[PDB]
RNA sequence: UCU
């Protein structure tokens, strides 16, 4: 567990999964990315990409927006 | 701000 990043707040069009996936990809091995509307999910393999995600992301600009950038809780 |  604690694998999975959560995006809180991604715009709610002209977003994809390839976007996500070059902006996280740098953190870890990305398995798997879902979008269900302003809510992203990115699990990666291990929780440390987790944790270098939020810590480096949560400073920068995307989307033309600061991120919402969290430890995923979702079951 | 959790499919």
Do not use: T, W
Not at 32 to 41: E, P, S, V
Request: overall charge positive; glycine content about 6%; hydrophobic content about 40%.
């Amino acid at each position: 567990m604690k694998s999975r990043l959560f995006i809180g707040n991604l715009p709610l069009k002209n977003v994809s999964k390839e976007d996500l996936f070059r902006i996280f990809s740098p953190y870890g091995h990305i398995m798997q990315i879902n979008i269900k509307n302003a809510f992203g999910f990115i699990q990666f393999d291990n929780p440390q990409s987790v944790r270098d995600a939020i810590e480096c992301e949560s400073q920068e600009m995307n989307f033309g927006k600061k991120l919402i950038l969290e430890v995923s809780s979702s079951n």
